[PDB]
Design a protein around this ligand. Structure first.
Ligand SMILES: C[N+]1(C)CCC(C(=O)O)CC1
Ligand SMILES: C[N+]1(C)CCC(C(=O)O)CC1
Ligand SMILES: O=C(O)CNC(=O)C(=O)O
Ligand SMILES: O=C(O)CNC(=O)C(=O)O
Ligand code: NI
Ligand code: NI
Ligand SMILES: [Zn+2]
Ligand SMILES: [Zn+2]
Lengths: 385, 385
């Protein structure tokens, strides 16, 4: 393309910069030190690993270009210490430091597109076996999971082992103290409120961990008619509404460290403690994770006394917003249904149901790391494209 | 004790607070809403899970105490809606909201004690089998690992499978794309610079992940005489020196998001991307993690052009400080040695060695999550005490 063809290349600014004039008449600037740092020759770069061999120690941060020649597709550079580098035009173009270029590349790397939703949610639904079998369907699955925060898979069996197949489709599951997979059912001497018939209000799973699970998989094996409906809410949407309606509540929940705890025995014996802000913001002030499970929020609360009641007042507002008819989406899982969702963004709940002699309700669940999911998503996109 | 015995209990401030006068004449304040939130009765609290059943929805954030009686060891409270609660004196005392009380409890939960070191490091060393066999030794191991950031274990075998035993002693290992465990040796078509004979400058492992491994285990199976010495540095100590010597460099490295990448095939196929600040600060400005591997730092660099060379200048200063004779500690692993260290705090390196026809050097490594390690540490402390 004209955009990726070199019309002129030259060293500028004490030879500390290279400028490319492209044939579309746009110009790009590349710091000399970055070029040297990213020399792709076999001394500096290990092709089989696609990784840098060059040490920081070898880099003169005040380096300038000693010599430069070019043709339409390549730049050829000599450095002051006689090192020699070649850079490809398309490789340079992609890495252009302009905001527009960098932003475009970031979107391609990290799939930032996000669709907020409330009670109007149309639950994205795909077939289980299709997803396992076809890359086009697995791509739709993971891309939708990232964008919308949840996908329902229908047509799985009513037997354990289904979430493990999805785990393999992704890469591998995220092991925790509750196992590689775990059975959500009523249990004698339950080590977790999830393993009872009680109502679960909106929560994220495992805030007791510093790194809570990114993605949750829940497969319905048995369902009861006496209750047990699922409820979800878009935590990012709720946070936006909270900041608007009650900035003071938002400020408290996005700045106060809450202690979470989990003690007991399952995969092995554990005694787990963490601290999270319930609304976790990035350095730009955007919400990147919600960390909230009212069951595992500790009795220990590490704040001064005067901050305690305002925190609870803020928390109540947040929960009231989640429960709003405009915010929450309700549905009931059937045997063979699997839901897969963003556990950093969505909060989920379940309605109480009745206990009985034998098991009337059974889900099998598992977790996955977002980096594992994003890796598979990147690869799938490449295969389908 | 006099400290944990109740002399007087009363409701204050519109009954929105409870005050305890202890027999040591100290006073403690407990917000009414926190008391109600943390009622330990069987309606509100699930004993078998040690978890809260009470919903945020059930909590009146403006609640006050309706009635209160007490004896030396318990408080008995009635609430406005006729709910009834009992709280134990020692339980209350521990959770006192005074800064001194909260801080003491936080130290007990999270083991914050930290000993910074440089080239004067005395490498903490324990016997491998002792650690597996005796809780007192496993406690010394993990507590020292947390405090100092590294422990050497001697007297393991010269065969694979040793780091897996330590993994079980902790609880379980942290699975990544390179496997449950992995073999550090020279490999044809290496997918990582670690799997070559090249020099590795100081780095943390796996900054290409959003959640890099907290603890690293490295077991020497075979060692070469031609090089391959290990080097470590206390990243937290180095960061302190950098902030002092070059606050501008510290500011850049603690504020600039660097892209990391890892693409290839090992446990399965992967295409991994992340962003980290090299010096990662908490909300108080204290360093909590270093994220830096020069091999996996991407060619993609998502900053404006004018920030590029100053970043490299800052990075060079940081690396130069790490390499200072006062900072780094050098040693050579022997067959049967295992080092276990804090991969969020320490940076580690290895000297190049010579390639040859058969394998002259072989380490087996694995990772563990700090939450898994801290859990085991908490349990061990309880067993030994
Ligand atoms: C599967 N299981 C029990 C893991 C821990 C979650 C939590 O307690 O936050 C609930 C669900
Ligand atoms: C074991 N292995 C290969 C995992 C990835 C680390 C990294 O590339 O940061 C190097 C060490
Ligand atoms: O039982 C359900 O429907 C939901 N269960 C959970 O969210 C859980 O295990 O924490
Ligand atoms: O080979 C060594 O001694 C150290 N290896 C590593 O730090 C690695 O695998 O990244
Ligand atoms: Ni849950
Ligand atoms: Ni390493
Ligand atoms: Zn080169
Ligand atoms: Zn109660």
């Amino acid at each position: 393309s004209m955009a990726c063809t070199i019309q002129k290349a030259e060293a500028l600014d004490g030879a500390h910069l290279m400028q490319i004039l492209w044939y579309d008449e746009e110009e790009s600037l590349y710091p000399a030190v970055w070029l040297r740092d990213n020399c792709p020759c076999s001394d500096c770069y290990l092709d089989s690993a696609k990784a840098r061999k060059l040490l920081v120690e070898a880099l003169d941060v005040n380096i300038g270009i000693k010599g430069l020649i070019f043709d339409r597709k390549k730049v050829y550079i000599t450095w002051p210490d006689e090192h020699y580098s070649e850079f490809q035009a398309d490789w340079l173009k992609k890495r252009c430091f302009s905001k527009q270029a960098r932003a475009k590349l970031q979107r391609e790397l990290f799939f930032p597109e996000c669709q907020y939703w409330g009670s109007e949610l149309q639950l994205p639904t795909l077939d289980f076996e299709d997803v396992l079998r076809y890359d086009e369907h697995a791509y739709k699955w993971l891309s939708t999971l990232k964008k919308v925060g949840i996908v329902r898979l229908t047509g799985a069996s009513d037997k354990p082992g289904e979430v493990s197949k999805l785990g393999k489709r992704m890469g591998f599951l995220y092991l925790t103290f509750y196992g590689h997979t775990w059975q959500v059912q009523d249990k004698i001497d339950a080590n977790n409120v999830a393993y009872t018939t009680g109502k679960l209000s909106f929560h994220t799973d495992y805030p007791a961990l510093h790194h809570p699970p990114g993605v949750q998989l829940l497969h319905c094996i048995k369902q009861t008619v006496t209750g047990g409906d699922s409820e979800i809410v878009d935590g990012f949407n709720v946070c936006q509404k909270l900041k608007k309606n009650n900035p003071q509540a938002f400020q408290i929940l996005s700045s106060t460290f809450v202690d979470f705890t989990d003690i007991g025995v399952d995969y092995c014996d554990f005694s787990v403690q963490s601290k999270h802000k319930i609304i976790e913001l990035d350095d730009k002030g955007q919400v990147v994770r919600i960390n909230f499970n009212n069951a595992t929020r500790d009795t220990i609360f590490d704040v001064p006394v005067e901050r305690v009641q305002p925190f609870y007042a803020a928390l109540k507002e947040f929960v009231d917003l989640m429960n709003s008819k405009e915010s929450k989406f309700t549905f009931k899982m059937n045997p063979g249904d699997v839901i897969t969702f963003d556990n950093w963004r969505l909060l989920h709940g379940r309605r109480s149901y009745e206990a009985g002699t034998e098991i009337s309700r059974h889900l099998e669940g598992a977790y996955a790391d977002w980096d594992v999911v994003m890796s598979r998503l990147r690869i799938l996109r490449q295969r389908v494209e």
